[PDB]
Amino acid sequence: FEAIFGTFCNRLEWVYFLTSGLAAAAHAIKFHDLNKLTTGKMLFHVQVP
Amino acid sequence: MENWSALELLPKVGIPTDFLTHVKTSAGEEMFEALRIYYGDDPERYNIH
Amino acid sequence: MAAMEANIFCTFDHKLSIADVGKLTKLVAAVVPIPQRLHLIKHYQLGLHQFVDHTRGYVRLRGLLRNMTLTLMRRVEGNQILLHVPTHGLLYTVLNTGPVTWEKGDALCVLPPLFHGPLARENLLTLGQWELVLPWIVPMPLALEINQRLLIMGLFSLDRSYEEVKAAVQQLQTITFRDATFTIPDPVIDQHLLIDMKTACLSMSMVANLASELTMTYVRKLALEDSSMLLVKCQELLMRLRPQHVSPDDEIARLSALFVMLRQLDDLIREQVVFTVCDVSPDNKSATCIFKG
Amino acid sequence: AMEANIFCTFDHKLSIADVGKLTKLVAAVVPIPQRLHLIKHYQLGLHQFVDHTRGYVRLRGLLRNMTLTLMRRVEGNQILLHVPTHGLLYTVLNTGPVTWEKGDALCVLPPLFHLLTLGQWELVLPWIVPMPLALEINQRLLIMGLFSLDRSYEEVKAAVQQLQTITFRDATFTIPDPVIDQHLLIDMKTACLSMSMVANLASELTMTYVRKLALEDSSMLLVKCQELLMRLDRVSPDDEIARLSALFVMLRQLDDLIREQVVFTVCDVSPDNKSATCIFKG
Amino acid sequence: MDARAVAKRPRDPADEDNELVTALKAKREVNTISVRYLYHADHQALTARFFVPEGLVEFEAQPGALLIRMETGCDSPRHLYISLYLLGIRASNVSASTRCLLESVYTASAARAALQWLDLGPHLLHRRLETLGCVKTVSLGITSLLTCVMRGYLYNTLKTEVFALMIPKDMYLTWEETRGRLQYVYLIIVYDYDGPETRPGIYVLTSSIAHWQTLVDVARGKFARERCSFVNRRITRPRQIPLCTGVIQKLGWCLADDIHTSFLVHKELKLSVVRLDNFSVELGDFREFV
C-alpha cells in the first residue's frame, strides 16, 4: 500500500476591516474620487474661556 | 499664470470671432496678454486635483 | 519575484500645494531616472537629487546617470505618478525641458544638466530641501561636443600649472551649438575621468603603432599635389616637414585592427543612442520618438 | 485591424506590364527619408540621393538614418509601404548580389554594381549583405582610396587589381573603383584624410601625454605602452587645445565607416534562394 | 471614421474566430481537422528550425543550451552548429578534470571535426563563431532537428513548461555579491596572447550593469593580465597584427531570484551547471574591447 489518508487545504481566518475591532478607532468612509484629492485639511476656531 | 485647467473644460458661450490675421501670427506679437498653445490631445484637461 | 512591471507608481509622501501640482501636470511625457524598479516607490529615488555630492563631479554624474533607468511620466493626478517603463523600439512621444533646440532625423542622449544656476530659473519642484532635477535630453552633436571637450580638459590637465588650466577652463566652457550658449557646470578632475584618459592614451598609442607607412604619409603626399582650404586648415596643425614597399595582404589586417582601435577610442565619447525622433512639434517642446530606452 | 502602411502614390501613367514588373518586388527593402504617411515616388529609394560628384561614403552617411520600409502590397495607382518595428519578423527578398545562409547578420549597403525606369526616374534599391562581406567592402574601399595619389606606378595597378575583387561562398565579385580619372572624389578624399590625420596626430602627441601620465602610472600596463612608443620613435598650449580638438573632429568625421549596426538576422531562407525570413533589429 | 468605431472596445485578437473558422462557417462544411483553437497563436518565441548531425546533438536532449553556429572556409559546409558545452575544449577557463570528462562524451566524428576546424585559420573565434540562442526541442533521429529561439522566452508549446538555459560551471562568472534585482547576461570571450596557448577564455557574465561603457570599463579592470599579455605579445613579436583582445555581446536577461545550480545527466555522466530558469533571448552582435 501507499495509502493517501486525505488531502487538506488551508481555509484562512477571513478578516474584514469592520469585524476587527481596531476599526473602532476608525471612521471609515468610501470616496470614489480619492486619487483626485491632494491634501485633506480641516480648520478650527476657538474663542478662549 | 492663469488657471488653464478650467477654460478648456467648462461649458463656454459661443462667439463669432473677428481675427486680424491667422491666429498663430496673432500670438506671435502678444495681442493676447497671456498665452497657451498646446497642439495634440493634451492630458492637462484629463486630470482634476 | 515578479518581472519588470510596466507601471511604477510614484507617490509624493509630503503634503502638496496647488501650484506645485500645476507645475507637475505640465511635466507629463518627460524623462526620469529610477534606480529601484519597484511598484509603489516613494519620491526620494525619483530624479537626480539623490546624486548631488558636495563635489558635483560632472564626469561622475555623467557616469552615474547611464546606470539608472530612463522612464516616462504619465497620468499626473493627485499624489500619483504613473511611470511608464520603456520597451525596445516602440513609438511614444516625449517632452523636453532644457532650452536645447531639436530638429528631425537626429538621435538623442541623456545627460546631466548645464549652466546650473537660478539665473536659468528652473521651476523644478521646491519642497523639503529636495528639488526634482531632471536629466537633459540633448541631440548627438551637442553630446559629442561636450564629451570631447570634457575629455580634452581631462587629458590637458596633466603636468601643467594652476593658471594655464584656468585659462583653458575660461576658454573651453563656452558652447555655441545652434545659436545658443551653454556652459559646463563645475568640471573637476576625477578618477573616472582618469581611467577614461588612461584607456584613451592607450588607444592613441595603439593607433600610433598600428598605422602603416602610407596610412601616415598620405596627407604628406597629398600636400604636394592638391591644395584646398581643408588641407591648409589642417596642415598648419600638423608638423612642418613612390612607395618603397607595399603589401595589400598586410594592409588589410592593419586596417582590420585599426578600425577596432578607432572603435575603442570613439566609444568613450559617443555614449549610447537612447531616442531617435521621427518628427517634432513646430514649437519645439515635444516630439514623437522611437526606441524608448 | 490595419497596420502602419505608408500610402505611396505615383505621378505617372503605367502600363499593365509596368505593374507586372513592379509586383515582383514585394518583400524588398526601401529607404525613406522621413516617416511620413503619404509620399510620391520621387522620395522612394536612393536615386534622389545619387550625386555625380559625391560617392559611396556620402551615400552611406545618408543611409544610417533611413526608415527601412518594405512593400506589403501594390495595387491601382498606389503602393502600400510597411514600416517594420524592432521585435517582429518579416520576409526580405534576396535582392543583394550575394546570397545568404541560415544564421547570418545582415545590413545595408549602396548598390556598387547595377527595376523601374522613367524619363527622370530610375527605381533603385539598396544592397542587403551579410556583415563579414560588409566589413571586407569597407576595408577594401578605404585602402583602394588610399592608393589614389600613387596610381601612376606599374605594380600598384596590379595591387588594386588584386584588391578590386572579393571572395565569398561562390561569389567571385568585384567592385567599381572609387577614383575616377586619376583624382579622388571629395567624399573618399575626406574619408582617407581623416584616417591620415588621426594617424599623424597619434604618432605625435601620445608620447608627450603618456610621459605626462607616467608619474601617475598606477598599473603595469601604461609603462609597457610607453616602452612600445619609445621603441617606435627610433610651444603655446592653445596649439595643444587646437590639436586635440582637431583630433576629435577628424574622429567625428569618420564614424560612418568605423562600424555597422546589425539590421536583419536571417532565420530561414527560401529554397532556390530568393527570399528569407528576418527578425528586424535596430 | 465615425465616433462609434473609435469608441468601440478593441477586438479581442484571440476570442474572435480564426481565419479557418470564418472561412468554414460562411460556407458550412465539416472536416476531420479540429480547428477552433490554433496552437502557437499566442506565441512570441520566434523559433527557427535547424538540422544537425548526430555528433553535435549530445548534451542537447535536455532542453536549454547555446546553439552557437560557426563557419568553415571549405565550401561544402557553409555553417555548423556547435553547442556551448562542446566549446569547452577550446575554452582555456575549463578545468582539466571537466575537460577530460566532456571529451569522453563528444567522441563522434562531427565534434572533433569542428574542433579541428576551430583552430586552423588565421582568425580568432569572434570572427569565426556566431551566436543564435537557445534550443528547446529535439527530434533525435540520426540527422536530428533543433528549433532554436532567437527572441522571446523559452517555453514548451501550450505554455506549460518554462524551459531553462544551463551553462557549465567553468564558464559562469559573476562580479558582485550584492546581485541586483534585474540582471543581464553577456557572452565574454577573452584572449590570452600566449604563443602556443592562444586558446581563448570563455565566460558567461551575469551582471546588473546594462550600459556598455560602464561594462567595458569594469571589464578592462578584470582582465588586466590578459590586456598586458596583449601588449606583451605586441612588443615581443612586432610585425604581427592581433586585434580584439576581448569581445562581449548581449545574450539576454534573467530575474536574479532563480539563477541556481543543477547538474546535467547524459549517459550517467553528471556535470554541475548554473541554471537560468526564466531566460530571455535578446541578441547583440560581437562588440570588442581592448
How far apart CA C239 and CA A32 sit, in angstroms, is 77
How far apart CA C15 and CA C39 sit, in angstroms, is 21
Q: In what order do the strands lie in the sheet with D105-109?
A: D89-93, D275-280, D264-269, D105-109, D127-130
| CA–CA distances in Å: residue C223 to residues A5, D98, E113 | 97, 39, 54
How far apart CA B33 and CA E207 sit, in angstroms, is 56
E47: nearest Cα among E123, E140, E151, E125: E151
Residue type at position E269: L
E224: nearest Cα among C193, C199, D210: C199
Q: What is the DSSP letter of D183?
A: B
E166: nearest Cα among E89, E271, E81, E53: E271
> How close E280 comes to chain D (CA, Å)?
13
Strand blocks (E) in E3-157: 46-52, 67-70, 80-83, 129-130, 134-138, 144-151
> Which three cell numbers, joined as nine digits, stand for B20?
486680424
Q: What is the DSSP letter of A25?
A: G
> Which three cell numbers, joined as nine digits, stand for C163?
593658471
Interface test with C, best of E126, E243, E247 (most C CBs within 10 A): E243
φ, ψ for residue E39 (rounded to 5)? -75, 160
Yes or no: say if C83 and C7 are a contact pair by the CB < 8 Å rule: yes
In sign, the C-alpha dihedral spanning D75, D79, D84, D89 is: positive
Interface test with D, best of C149, C218, C252 (most D CBs within 10 A): C218
User: Would strands E80-83 and E201-207 be described as parallel, antiparallel, or unpaired?
Assistant: unpaired
C284 touches chain E (CB under 8 A): no
Yes or no: say if E99 and E171 are a contact pair by the CB < 8 Å rule: no
Strand blocks (E) in chain C: 7-10, 31-34, 69-77, 80-84, 94-95, 107-111, 126-127, 130-131, 136-139, 275-280, 286-290
Query: Other C-beta atoms within 10 Å of D192: how many?
Result: 26
Yes or no: say if C261 and C207 are a contact pair by the CB < 8 Å rule: yes
| CA–CA distances in Å: residue C219 to residues C225, D181, D192 | 10, 20, 9
C221 touches chain D (CB under 8 A): yes
Interface of B with C (CB under 8 A): 1, 5, 37, 39-40, 43-44, 47-49
Strand blocks (E) in E131-200: 134-138, 144-151, 165-168, 172-173, 183-190
Residues of A in contact with C21 (CB under 8 A): 38
E171: nearest Cα among E201, E209, E199: E201
**C159: three-class secondary structure by DSSP:** coil
Question: Which residues does C21 contact at the CB level (< 8 Å), separation at least 6?
Answer: A38, B49, C76, C78
How far apart CA E99 and CA D248 sit, in angstroms, is 47
φ, ψ for residue B25 (rounded to 5)? -80, -30
Q: Which residue has the cell 536645447?
A: C100
Give bridge partners of residue D70 from the DSSP assignment.
Answer: D82
**Contact call for E and B: 3+ CB–CB distances under 8 Å:** no
* D267–E285 CB contact, under 8 Å: no
**D1, D102, D224 member nearest E235 (Cβ):** D224
* D198–C205 CB contact, under 8 Å: no
**D192: three-class secondary structure by DSSP:** helix
Residues of D in contact with C256 (CB under 8 A): 135, 139
Q: Which residue of D has its CA nearest to C290?
A: D85
Count CA atoms closer than 13 A to C186's CA, side-chain side: 13
Yes or no: say if D49 and D60 are a contact pair by the CB < 8 Å rule: no
How far apart CA E23 and CA E17 sit, in angstroms, is 10
**D139, D225, D255 member nearest C256 (Cβ):** D139
Q: What is the DSSP letter of C135?
A: P
Q: Which residue of E has its CA nearest to D268?
A: E48
Question: What was the elucidation method?
Answer: cryo-EM
User: Would strands D105-109 and E46-52 be described as parallel, antiparallel, or unpaired?
Assistant: unpaired
D280: nearest Cα among D87, D14, D81, D16: D87
Yes or no: say if E110 and E55 are a contact pair by the CB < 8 Å rule: yes
> Which three cell numbers, joined as nine digits, stand for D211?
610621459
φ, ψ for residue D70 (rounded to 5)? -115, -175
Interface of C with B (CB under 8 A): 18, 21-22, 25-26, 28, 74-78, 93, 281-283, 286
How far apart CA B13 and CA C293 sit, in angstroms, is 45
Q: In what order do the strands lie in the sheet with C31-34?
A: C7-10, C80-84, C69-77, C31-34
How far apart CA E126 and CA C183 sit, in angstroms, is 43
> Which three cell numbers, joined as nine digits, stand for E231?
601588449
User: Would strands E201-207 and E172-173 be described as parallel, antiparallel, or unpaired?
Assistant: parallel
User: Would strands D67-75 and D78-82 be described as parallel, antiparallel, or unpaired?
Assistant: antiparallel
How far apart CA D85 and CA D82 sit, in angstroms, is 10
Q: Which residue has the cell 582568425?
A: E123
Task: Provide the CA C161 distance to its chain's centre, in angstroms.
Answer: 29
- Backbone breaks in chain C after residues (C–N over 2.5 Å): 241
Strand blocks (E) in C128-248: 130-131, 136-139
- Given resolution (angstroms): 4.2
**B1, B37, B49 member nearest C21 (Cβ):** B49
Q: Which residue has the cell 569594469?
A: E218
> How close C12 comes to chain B (CA, Å)?
14
> How close C101 comes to chain E (CA, Å)?
27
Interface test with D, best of E1, E9, E46, E145 (most D CBs within 10 A): E46
φ, ψ for residue E128 (rounded to 5)? -105, -40
φ, ψ for residue D155 (rounded to 5)? -80, -40
DSSP H helical ranges for chain E: 3-7, 19-24, 96-102, 109-118, 213-220, 224-236
Yes or no: say if D133 and D166 are a contact pair by the CB < 8 Å rule: yes
Give bridge partners of residue E250 from the DSSP assignment.
Answer: E186
Yes or no: say if C72 and C292 are a contact pair by the CB < 8 Å rule: yes
Yes or no: say if D179 and C184 are a contact pair by the CB < 8 Å rule: no
> Which three cell numbers, joined as nine digits, stand for C284?
519645439
